[PDB]
């Protein structure tokens, strides 16, 4: 089902625009099964917000 938890733990461990790009794809894959997920819909907004600040 919704796998944003797996995408998040994977990005958070990397952070401790190469990890953001990997996290943007991951969330776009599980996107279909995350259709009504609050933590996913915040992640889409979160990733988008870090693509502008810092811009890459």
């Amino acid at each position: 089902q919704c796998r944003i938890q797996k995408c998040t733990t994977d990005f958070v461990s990397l952070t401790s625009c190469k990890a953001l790009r990997a996290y943007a794809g991951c969330t776009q894959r599980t996107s279909k099964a995350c259709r009504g997920n609050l933590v996913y819909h915040s992640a889409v907004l979160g990733i988008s917000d870090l693509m502008s600040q810092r811009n890459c």
Partner: protein, 101 residues
């Protein structure tokens, strides 16, 4: 300095850009918690009592924090792949009560 209590907060889903997936409602009253957790009645853990006493002796240790201690669910509508409406109950969306933790 104003003490720990709930404060009103209407969340308009279009303002946070969540109107791209939430069919209904257009927003809701979430509320929020804010205020001082002072040494001298509030809902607090034993840890929050201790941290507050430690803070009164050493300022470098912060006071307990004013956070939601009682929350309630709301139901929202979204769409599935087929543009069919799906109702879902989202837990801990509304603040019923604040406390020091």
């Amino acid at each position: 300095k104003s003490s720990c209590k709930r404060h009103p907060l209407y969340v308009d889903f279009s303002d946070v850009g969540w109107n791209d997936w939430i069919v209904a409602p257009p927003g809701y009253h979430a509320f929020y918690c804010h205020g001082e957790c002072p040494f001298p009645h509030l809902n607090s853990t034993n840890h929050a009592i201790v941290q507050t006493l430690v803070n009164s002796v050493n300022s470098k240790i912060p006071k307990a924090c004013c956070v939601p201690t009682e929350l309630s669910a709301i139901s929202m509508l979204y769409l599935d792949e087929n543009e069919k409406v799906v109702l879902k109950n989202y837990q801990d969306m509304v603040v019923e009560g604040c406390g020091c933790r």
